[PDB]
Amino acid sequence: AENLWVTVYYGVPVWKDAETTLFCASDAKEKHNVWATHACVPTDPNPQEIHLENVTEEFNMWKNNMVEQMHEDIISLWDQSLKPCVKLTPLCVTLQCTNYAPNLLSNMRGELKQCSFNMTTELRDKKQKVYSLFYRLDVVQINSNKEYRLINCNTSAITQACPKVSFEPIPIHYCAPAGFAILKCKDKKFNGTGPCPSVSTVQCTHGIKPVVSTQLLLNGSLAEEEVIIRSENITNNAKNILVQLNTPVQINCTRPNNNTVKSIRIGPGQAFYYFGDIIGDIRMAHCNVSKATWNETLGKVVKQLRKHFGNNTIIRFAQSSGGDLEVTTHSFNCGGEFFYCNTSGLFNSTWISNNDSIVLPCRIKQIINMWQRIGQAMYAPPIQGVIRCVSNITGLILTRDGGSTNSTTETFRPGGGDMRDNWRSELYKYKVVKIEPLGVAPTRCKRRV
Amino acid sequence: NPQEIHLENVTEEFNMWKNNMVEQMHEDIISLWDQSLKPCVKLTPLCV
Amino acid sequence: IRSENITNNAKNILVQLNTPVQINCTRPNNNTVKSIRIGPGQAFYYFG
Amino acid sequence: VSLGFLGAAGSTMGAASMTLTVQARNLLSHWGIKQLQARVLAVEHYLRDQQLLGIWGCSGKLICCTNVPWNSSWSNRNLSEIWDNMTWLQWDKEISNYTQIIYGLLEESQNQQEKNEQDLLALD
Amino acid sequence: VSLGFLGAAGSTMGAASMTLTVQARNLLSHWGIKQLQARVLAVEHYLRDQQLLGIWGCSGKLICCTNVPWNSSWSNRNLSEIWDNMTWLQWDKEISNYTQIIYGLLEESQNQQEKNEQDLLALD
Amino acid sequence: VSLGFLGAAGSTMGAASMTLTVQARNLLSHWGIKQLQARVLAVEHYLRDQQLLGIWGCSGKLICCTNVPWNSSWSNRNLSEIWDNMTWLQWDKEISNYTQIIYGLLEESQNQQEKNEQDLLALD
Ligand SMILES: *[C@@H]1O[C@H](CO)[C@@H](O[C@@H]2O[C@H](CO)[C@@H](O[C@@H]3O[C@H](CO[C@H]4O[C@H](CO)[C@@H](O)[C@H](O)[C@@H]4O)[C@@H](O)[C@H](O)[C@@H]3O)[C@H](O)[C@H]2NC(C)=O)[C@H](O)[C@H]1NC(C)=O
Ligand SMILES: *[C@@H]1O[C@H](CO)[C@@H](O[C@@H]2O[C@H](CO)[C@@H](O[C@@H]3O[C@H](CO)[C@@H](O)[C@H](O)[C@@H]3O)[C@H](O)[C@H]2NC(C)=O)[C@H](O)[C@H]1NC(C)=O
Ligand SMILES: *[C@@H]1O[C@H](CO)[C@@H](O[C@@H]2O[C@H](CO)[C@@H](O)[C@H](O)[C@H]2NC(C)=O)[C@H](O)[C@H]1NC(C)=O
Ligand SMILES: *[C@@H]1O[C@H](CO)[C@@H](O[C@@H]2O[C@H](CO)[C@@H](O)[C@H](O)[C@H]2NC(C)=O)[C@H](O)[C@H]1NC(C)=O
Ligand SMILES: *[C@@H]1O[C@H](CO)[C@@H](O[C@@H]2O[C@H](CO)[C@@H](O)[C@H](O)[C@H]2NC(C)=O)[C@H](O)[C@H]1NC(C)=O
Ligand SMILES: *[C@@H]1O[C@H](CO)[C@@H](O[C@@H]2O[C@H](CO)[C@@H](O)[C@H](O)[C@H]2NC(C)=O)[C@H](O)[C@H]1NC(C)=O
Ligand SMILES: *[C@@H]1O[C@H](CO)[C@@H](O[C@@H]2O[C@H](CO)[C@@H](O)[C@H](O)[C@H]2NC(C)=O)[C@H](O)[C@H]1NC(C)=O
Ligand SMILES: *[C@@H]1O[C@H](CO)[C@@H](O[C@@H]2O[C@H](CO)[C@@H](O)[C@H](O)[C@H]2NC(C)=O)[C@H](O)[C@H]1NC(C)=O
Ligand SMILES: *[C@@H]1O[C@H](CO)[C@@H](O[C@@H]2O[C@H](CO)[C@@H](O)[C@H](O)[C@H]2NC(C)=O)[C@H](O)[C@H]1NC(C)=O
Ligand SMILES: *[C@@H]1O[C@H](CO)[C@@H](O[C@@H]2O[C@H](CO)[C@@H](O)[C@H](O)[C@H]2NC(C)=O)[C@H](O)[C@H]1NC(C)=O
Ligand SMILES: *[C@@H]1O[C@H](CO)[C@@H](O)[C@H](O)[C@H]1NC(C)=O
Ligand SMILES: *[C@@H]1O[C@H](CO)[C@@H](O)[C@H](O)[C@H]1NC(C)=O
Ligand SMILES: *[C@@H]1O[C@H](CO)[C@@H](O)[C@H](O)[C@H]1NC(C)=O
Ligand SMILES: *[C@@H]1O[C@H](CO)[C@@H](O)[C@H](O)[C@H]1NC(C)=O
Ligand SMILES: *[C@@H]1O[C@H](CO)[C@@H](O)[C@H](O)[C@H]1NC(C)=O
Ligand SMILES: *[C@@H]1O[C@H](CO)[C@@H](O)[C@H](O)[C@H]1NC(C)=O
Ligand SMILES: *[C@@H]1O[C@H](CO)[C@@H](O)[C@H](O)[C@H]1NC(C)=O
Ligand SMILES: *[C@@H]1O[C@H](CO)[C@@H](O)[C@H](O)[C@H]1NC(C)=O
Ligand SMILES: *[C@@H]1O[C@H](CO)[C@@H](O)[C@H](O)[C@H]1NC(C)=O
Ligand SMILES: *[C@@H]1O[C@H](CO)[C@@H](O)[C@H](O)[C@H]1NC(C)=O
Ligand SMILES: *[C@@H]1O[C@H](CO)[C@@H](O)[C@H](O)[C@H]1NC(C)=O
Ligand SMILES: *[C@@H]1O[C@H](CO)[C@@H](O)[C@H](O)[C@H]1NC(C)=O
Ligand SMILES: *[C@@H]1O[C@H](CO)[C@@H](O)[C@H](O)[C@H]1NC(C)=O
Ligand SMILES: *[C@@H]1O[C@H](CO)[C@@H](O)[C@H](O)[C@H]1NC(C)=O
Ligand SMILES: *[C@@H]1O[C@H](CO)[C@@H](O)[C@H](O)[C@H]1NC(C)=O
Ligand SMILES: *[C@@H]1O[C@H](CO)[C@@H](O)[C@H](O)[C@H]1NC(C)=O
C-alpha cells in the first residue's frame, strides 16, 4: 500500500504531431457536372467546434502539409475531368488572316483577326472550308499578307473542354479520418507564426472556395478589426507579402458584345464549336472599381505597413515589371471565359508620412496554359450573349522590389503569380495531430488474486 | 450447396418497380461492356 | 548442378558458379545525337 | 455537464481521468480511393492497441488494475504532486524513455505468471 | 435441432432468445474493387457495436447483466405479457424513441461508477 | 531468454506452451493496390478467430479453462505421453478429423448453458 503499483489508462488526451491523407466532404443539396464533386460523402448539418482551455501550441504556416496536397488535389483532378473530352490535332494548320474595318475608335484597332483554313470532315478524303476569328493573343505569324499559326503548336497538344461541365467554384470541406483531429487558432490578429493562446478542435474545416486568380484574391474569406500583413522573412526581396483586407471592395467586370456561335463536325463523331461573328458594335471588356472605396482601402493598408518599415518613410506604389502575361496582369474566369486585365490605374499614387469609377481595360484569350506547365494546353468554347459577374476583392499580393541602402522608401508592385499563395490565405490556421490514447501512471491499487 | 432457410409466421410487404437490384444490374452491364471493348482494334479509316 | 529430370533433352541445366569471372563490354564510337519535332508537341531523338 | 472530445487536456491529471469515455467513443467514427485509404487506416490503428490491451489482462476495461511494483527509479516523485500539479501532456514527456521497459515487464511477468498459477491452482 | 440463420424471427421473444449463437457466427463470414468495397464495409459495421458492447461492461458475453433500474415510463407493461405475447420485430418498434436515453444512461452511470468504486474499494 | 517468432516449433508440447506471447504479438504487425489487398487480408484473418474465441467464453485469455469432458474416443492416450513425447505439429494431425465436433460441442453445451444458469441463479 505504501509502495505503488502501475495502472493502465485508455483514452487519455495527448496528441503529438504527424501527417496523413485527407478526403473531401461537401454538399448542400440540376447541378450536372463541375470539376468532380458528385457525392464525395455529403456533410453533416451541425459542425462540432469544441473550445479548449489553458492550452497553448506553437503554430507555423509556411511548413504545413495541408497546402502541399491541396495543390496536388487540383491539378490531378483537372486532368482527370478533361481526359475523355474531344481532342483536336487537326487544328494546327497554316492559316491566312486579315485585319478588320477602319474601326477608328483606336482601342480595338487591329485586335480581332478573321481567319480561314482547311479542316477535315467526316469522310477521310474530302475537305471542308471554314471561316472563324481569333483574338490577337492566339496567332503568331511566320516570319504584304502573311500566314499565321496557333500560339501553342510548337509546345503542347491542344484539347477542347467538354461543353457540358462548368468551372464555377463550389465550397469544399476537408475532413481528417477517424483517429485524428485538426486544431484551429481562434484569435483576431494573427501574424502567421507564433503561440496561439486559445485553440479549438474541429474535424472538418469551413467552406473553402477554390478560385483561381492572380494579383487580387477573389471571393475569399474576410478578416477582423484591422488588416494583417503576413510573410516569411521580410527584408528578403524574393518572398511575397500576403495582405488580407478588412472591408470588401466590389468589382463589376463584364463584356458588351453578343458573339454568335456555330458548330461543324471535325469527324467522324467529334463536334467543334468555333467562334462566329459579332453582332452590334465592338468595345473593350472592362471592369469598374468605385474610386471612393478604393482610396479608403489603400489608406488603411498603408497605415499598417508603417509597423514593418519604420514610421518615417514615404510609401510609393507602381506597375508590374514584365514577364509572361499571367504574372504582370490580373487574371480570372467569369462564367466560363478567361479575362486578362491590366490594373495600372490602381497601384499608382505615392504617399507621404504625415462618386467616380476607375476603368480597367481587359483583353481576352481563348487558349489557356494554366498552372505554369508545358505539355498540356486547353481550348475554351465561346458563350452566347453578354457576360456579367459581380465579385468582391478580399486580399492583395504585393512584391517588394530591391535596393541596397535604406535611402527613402522601398517601393511595392503586384505580381507573384505562383499558385500556392492562393491556398495559404485560408489554410493558415489548421494543423493535423494524432491521438495516442494510451498511458501508464502509479497509484495505490492492486489486482485481486 | 446454397442455404435456403424457411421462415414461419412472417409476412413482409413486397414491391417491384421500386427495387434497387434492377438499377445496378443495368449499370453493371453497360459499364462492363465498354471495359471489354476498350483495348480492341479501333478503325477510323473505314469512313471513306 | 540443378534441373528437373535430367535424361530429358528438352529441359535446361541451371549451373551456378563459385568464384566470379569479370567482363568488360564497351563501345568505342562517339555517336552525336540530334532532335527534331515529328509534331505537334512530341519530340524524336534520332541517331546522328 | 461533460465538456466534449479532448475536453480536459488543459486540466490536471486528477480531473481529466474522470471523463475518459468521451475519448473512447469518438475514436472509430476516381477519388473515392483516398476515402478508402482512410477507412482502412482508421481501423488498423484501432486494432493495434485493442490487441495490446488484450494481452495485458485488461480485456475490456478502462481503469484496469495490475500487479508489477513501481521501481521508483522511473519517477522519484510522491503520490500527491503527480495527480494535482501536472497535466497528461507533461507526464507523458517525463516518463518517456522508460516505456519499452514497462510494456515488456507488464505482460511477461503477469499473464505468463497468472495463467501458470491458475493452471497450477485449479488442479484441485 | 436448431433452425438456422434468422430462424426464429416469427417466434415469440421467450423462445427466440435461446438460439442466439446462430445470428452471431454468420455475421462476419477491374471489378474486384466492388468486392473490396464490400469486405471493408463488412468489417467496419462489425467493429462498431463490438466497440459498443466493450464500453457497457459486456465485453464478450451475449446475455449480460446490468444495474440501471427500469424507469417504467419507457414501457408500462408488466414483464410476462412481454416475453410471451410479442415478437422481437414488434418490441423494437414500441421502445423505439427511448433509446438514445438508454444508451447514454447505460454506460455513464455504470462504468463511470463501478471503476470509480473499485479504485476506491481496492485501496485496502 | 526467449527464442523468438515460431521459436519452439521443434520442441516438445510441454515446453512450447510457456512462450505463447511471442506468436500473439507479431500476428497483426498503380502498385499500392497490392499493398492494400494485403492490409485488408491481414486484418480479416485476425478478426475471424478473435470472434471465435469470444463465443467460447475465452474472451481475452490465452490459457482458458473449459468444462466439456474428454470423450476418450478422440484420443486414447494418457496424460504423460502427450505432453512429453509429441510436438504441436504432430498432435494437430492425429486429432484432425474430430474437430468440427469439438468446435460445435465447445460452445453449444457451455455458453448456452452457463448464461442460462446465471440468469436462473442471479434471480435471487
Ligand atoms: C464570386 O462569387 C460570385 C457570387 O458570390 C460569383 O457570381 C456568380 O457568377 C455566375 C456566373 O454567371 C452567376 O451564374 C448565373 O448563370 C446563369 C446562366 O449561366 C449558366 O447557367 C446554367 C448552369 O450552368 C447553364 O445551363 C447555362 O447555359 C449557363 O452556362 C445566368 O442566367 C445568371 O444571370 C448568372 O450569370 C451567378 O449568379 C453569380 N452569383 C450571384 C450571387 O450573382 C462570381 O462568379 C465569383 N467570382 C469568380 C471569379 O468566380
Ligand atoms: C486548302 O486546300 C486547298 C486545296 O486545293 C489549297 O489550295 C492549293 O494551294 C496550293 C498552294 O498554293 C496550290 O499550289 C499552287 O500551284 C500553282 C500552280 O501554278 C503554283 O504556281 C503555286 O506556287 C502553288 O504551288 C494549289 O494549286 C491549290 N489548289 C487549288 C485547287 O487551287 C489551299 O492552299 C489550302 N489552304 C488554304 C489556307 O486555303
Ligand atoms: C514556339 O513559338 C513561339 C512563338 O511566339 C516562340 O516564342 C518566340 O520566340 C522568339 C525566339 O527568337 C522570341 O524572339 C519571341 O519573343 C517569342 N515570342 C514571344 C511572344 O515571346 C517560342 O520560342 C517557340 N518555342 C520554342 C521552344 O522555341
Ligand atoms: C462580398 O460578397 C459576398 C457574397 O458575394 C457578400 O455576402 C453577403 O452579402 C449580403 C448583402 O449585404 C449580406 O446580407 C450577407 O450577410 C453576406 N453574407 C455573409 C455570410 O455575411 C458580402 O456582402 C460582400 N461584401 C463584403 C464581405 O464586404
Ligand atoms: C444578341 O443576339 C441574340 C441572338 O439572336 C438576340 O436574341 C434574339 O435573337 C432572335 C433571332 O436570333 C430575335 O428574333 C430575338 O428578337 C432576339 N431577342 C431579343 C430580346 O431581341 C439578341 O437580341 C442580341 N442582342 C443583345 C443580347 O443585346
Ligand atoms: C457594381 O454593380 C452593382 C450591381 O450590378 C452595383 O450595385 C448597385 O448600384 C446601384 C447604383 O445605381 C444602386 O442603386 C444599387 O442599390 C446597388 N445594388 C444593387 C443590389 O443593385 C454597384 O454600384 C456597381 N459598382 C460600381 C462601382 O458601379
Ligand atoms: C497598362 O496600361 C498602360 C496604359 O498605356 C500601358 O502602357 C504604359 O503606360 C505608361 C503610362 O501611360 C507608359 O509610361 C508606358 O510606356 C506604357 N507602356 C508600357 C509597355 O508600360 C501598360 O503597358 C499596360 N500594362 C500592361 C501590362 O500592358
Ligand atoms: C499615375 O499617377 C500620375 C501622377 O499622379 C498621373 O500623372 C498625372 O495625370 C493627371 C491626370 O489628369 C495629369 O493632370 C497630370 O499632369 C499627370 N502628371 C504627370 C507628372 O504625369 C498618371 O496619369 C497616373 N496614371 C494613370 C494610369 O492614372
Ligand atoms: C562481383 O561484383 C561485385 C560487385 O560488382 C563485387 O563486390 C564487391 O567487390 C569488392 C572489391 O573486391 C569487395 O571488396 C566487396 O567485398 C564485394 N562485395 C561483397 C558484398 O562482397 C565482387 O567482388 C565481384 N566478384 C566476385 C563475387 O567474385
Ligand atoms: C566526342 O564528341 C564530343 C562532343 O563534341 C567531344 O566533346 C567535346 O566537344 C566539344 C565540341 O562539341 C569540344 O569543344 C570539346 O573540346 C570536346 N571535349 C573534349 C574533352 O575534347 C569529345 O571530345 C569527342 N571524343 C571523345 C569522347 O573521345
Ligand atoms: C531569410 O531566411 C532566414 C532564415 O531562413 C531569415 O532568418 C532571414 O530573415 C532571411 N535571410 C536574410 C539573409 O535576411
Ligand atoms: C484619398 O484619401 C485621402 C485621405 O483619405 C485624401 O487625402 C486624398 O485626397 C484622397 N484622394 C486621392 C486621389 O488620393
Ligand atoms: C510610429 O508610430 C507608432 C504608432 O503609430 C509609434 O509607436 C512610434 O513611436 C512611431 N515612430 C517614432 C519614431 O516615433
Ligand atoms: C521426366 O519426367 C518424369 C516425371 O515427370 C521423370 O520421372 C523422368 O525422369 C522424365 N521422363 C522420362 C521418360 O525420362
Ligand atoms: C485553467 O487554469 C486556471 C488557472 O490556471 C484554473 O483555475 C482552471 O480550473 C483551469 N481550467 C480547467 C478547465 O480546469
Ligand atoms: C530498477 O531499474 C534499474 C534499471 O534502470 C535496475 O537496475 C534495478 O534493478 C531496478 N530495480 C528493481 C527493484 O528491479
Ligand atoms: C510530496 O512531496 C512534497 C515535497 O515538498 C511534500 O510536501 C508532500 O508531503 C509529498 N506527498 C506525500 C504524499 O508524501
Ligand atoms: C530518451 O529518449 C530520447 C528519444 O526518445 C533519446 O534520444 C534519449 O537517448 C533517451 N534517454 C536515454 C537516457 O537513453
Ligand atoms: C407460428 O404460429 C403458430 C400459431 O400462430 C404457432 O403455433 C407456432 O408455434 C408458430 N411457429 C413457431 C416456429 O413458433
Ligand atoms: C423517468 O423519465 C422521465 C423522462 O421521460 C424523467 O422525468 C423521470 O425523472 C424518470 N424517472 C426517474 C425515476 O428517473
Ligand atoms: C401483467 O399484466 C397482465 C395484463 O393481463 C396480467 O394479465 C398479468 O397477470 C400481469 N402479470 C404480472 C406478473 O404482473
Ligand atoms: C419517436 O421517433 C420518431 C422517429 O424516430 C419521431 O418522429 C418522433 O417524434 C419520436 N417521438 C417523440 C415523442 O418525440
Ligand atoms: C532438439 O532435439 C534434441 C534431441 O533430439 C533435444 O535434446 C533438444 O532439446 C531439442 N531442441 C530444443 C530447442 O528443445
Ligand atoms: C463419444 O463419441 C462417439 C461418436 O464418435 C459417440 O457415439 C459417443 O456417445 C461419445 N461418448 C459420449 C460419452 O458422449
Ligand atoms: C502413459 O502410458 C504409458 C504406457 O506404456 C505408461 O507407461 C504411463 O504410465 C502412462 N501414463 C499415465 C499417467 O498413466
Ligand atoms: C479425416 O479427414 C480426412 C481429410 O480431412 C478425410 O479424408 C477422412 O475421411 C477423415 N476420416 C474419417 C474417418 O472420416
PDB file of N, CA, C and O in Angstrom, chain D residues 47-60:
ATOM      1  N   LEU D  47      -7.192  -1.462 -34.080  1.00  0.00           N
ATOM      2  CA  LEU D  47      -6.983  -2.862 -33.719  1.00  0.00           C
ATOM      3  C   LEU D  47      -5.629  -3.100 -33.070  1.00  0.00           C
ATOM      4  O   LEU D  47      -5.434  -4.137 -32.433  1.00  0.00           O
ATOM      5  N   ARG D  48      -4.684  -2.173 -33.226  1.00  0.00           N
ATOM      6  CA  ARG D  48      -3.350  -2.398 -32.685  1.00  0.00           C
ATOM      7  C   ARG D  48      -3.333  -2.314 -31.168  1.00  0.00           C
ATOM      8  O   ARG D  48      -2.851  -3.232 -30.501  1.00  0.00           O
ATOM      9  N   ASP D  49      -3.847  -1.234 -30.592  1.00  0.00           N
ATOM     10  CA  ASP D  49      -3.825  -1.156 -29.137  1.00  0.00           C
ATOM     11  C   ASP D  49      -4.975  -1.933 -28.510  1.00  0.00           C
ATOM     12  O   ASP D  49      -4.917  -2.260 -27.322  1.00  0.00           O
ATOM     13  N   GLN D  50      -6.021  -2.239 -29.276  1.00  0.00           N
ATOM     14  CA  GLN D  50      -7.019  -3.170 -28.772  1.00  0.00           C
ATOM     15  C   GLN D  50      -6.462  -4.583 -28.640  1.00  0.00           C
ATOM     16  O   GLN D  50      -6.871  -5.314 -27.731  1.00  0.00           O
ATOM     17  N   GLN D  51      -5.530  -4.973 -29.509  1.00  0.00           N
ATOM     18  CA  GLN D  51      -4.677  -6.133 -29.269  1.00  0.00           C
ATOM     19  C   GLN D  51      -3.828  -5.952 -28.022  1.00  0.00           C
ATOM     20  O   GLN D  51      -3.680  -6.880 -27.220  1.00  0.00           O
ATOM     21  N   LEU D  52      -3.282  -4.754 -27.836  1.00  0.00           N
ATOM     22  CA  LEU D  52      -2.263  -4.555 -26.819  1.00  0.00           C
ATOM     23  C   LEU D  52      -2.871  -4.468 -25.427  1.00  0.00           C
ATOM     24  O   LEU D  52      -2.193  -4.767 -24.440  1.00  0.00           O
ATOM     25  N   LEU D  53      -4.142  -4.087 -25.318  1.00  0.00           N
ATOM     26  CA  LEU D  53      -4.800  -4.212 -24.025  1.00  0.00           C
ATOM     27  C   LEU D  53      -5.204  -5.646 -23.735  1.00  0.00           C
ATOM     28  O   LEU D  53      -5.255  -6.044 -22.569  1.00  0.00           O
ATOM     29  N   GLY D  54      -5.471  -6.438 -24.773  1.00  0.00           N
ATOM     30  CA  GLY D  54      -5.953  -7.791 -24.557  1.00  0.00           C
ATOM     31  C   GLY D  54      -4.897  -8.735 -24.025  1.00  0.00           C
ATOM     32  O   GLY D  54      -5.221  -9.804 -23.506  1.00  0.00           O
ATOM     33  N   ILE D  55      -3.625  -8.359 -24.141  1.00  0.00           N
ATOM     34  CA  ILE D  55      -2.561  -9.235 -23.679  1.00  0.00           C
ATOM     35  C   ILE D  55      -2.099  -8.814 -22.289  1.00  0.00           C
ATOM     36  O   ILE D  55      -1.384  -9.552 -21.606  1.00  0.00           O
ATOM     37  N   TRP D  56      -2.523  -7.635 -21.830  1.00  0.00           N
ATOM     38  CA  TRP D  56      -2.117  -7.179 -20.504  1.00  0.00           C
ATOM     39  C   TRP D  56      -3.096  -7.620 -19.430  1.00  0.00           C
ATOM     40  O   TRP D  56      -2.909  -7.297 -18.254  1.00  0.00           O
ATOM     41  N   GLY D  57      -4.145  -8.339 -19.807  1.00  0.00           N
ATOM     42  CA  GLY D  57      -5.147  -8.746 -18.845  1.00  0.00           C
ATOM     43  C   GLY D  57      -6.300  -7.770 -18.783  1.00  0.00           C
ATOM     44  O   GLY D  57      -7.346  -8.058 -18.197  1.00  0.00           O
ATOM     45  N   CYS D  58      -6.111  -6.602 -19.395  1.00  0.00           N
ATOM     46  CA  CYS D  58      -7.116  -5.546 -19.403  1.00  0.00           C
ATOM     47  C   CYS D  58      -7.933  -5.694 -20.681  1.00  0.00           C
ATOM     48  O   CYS D  58      -7.758  -4.965 -21.658  1.00  0.00           O
ATOM     49  N   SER D  59      -8.855  -6.659 -20.661  1.00  0.00           N
ATOM     50  CA  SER D  59      -9.511  -7.089 -21.892  1.00  0.00           C
ATOM     51  C   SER D  59     -10.519  -6.065 -22.392  1.00  0.00           C
ATOM     52  O   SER D  59     -10.577  -5.782 -23.592  1.00  0.00           O
ATOM     53  N   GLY D  60     -11.327  -5.512 -21.498  1.00  0.00           N
ATOM     54  CA  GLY D  60     -12.353  -4.590 -21.930  1.00  0.00           C
ATOM     55  C   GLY D  60     -12.602  -3.451 -20.970  1.00  0.00           C
ATOM     56  O   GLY D  60     -13.625  -2.771 -21.063  1.00  0.00           O
TER      57      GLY D  60
END
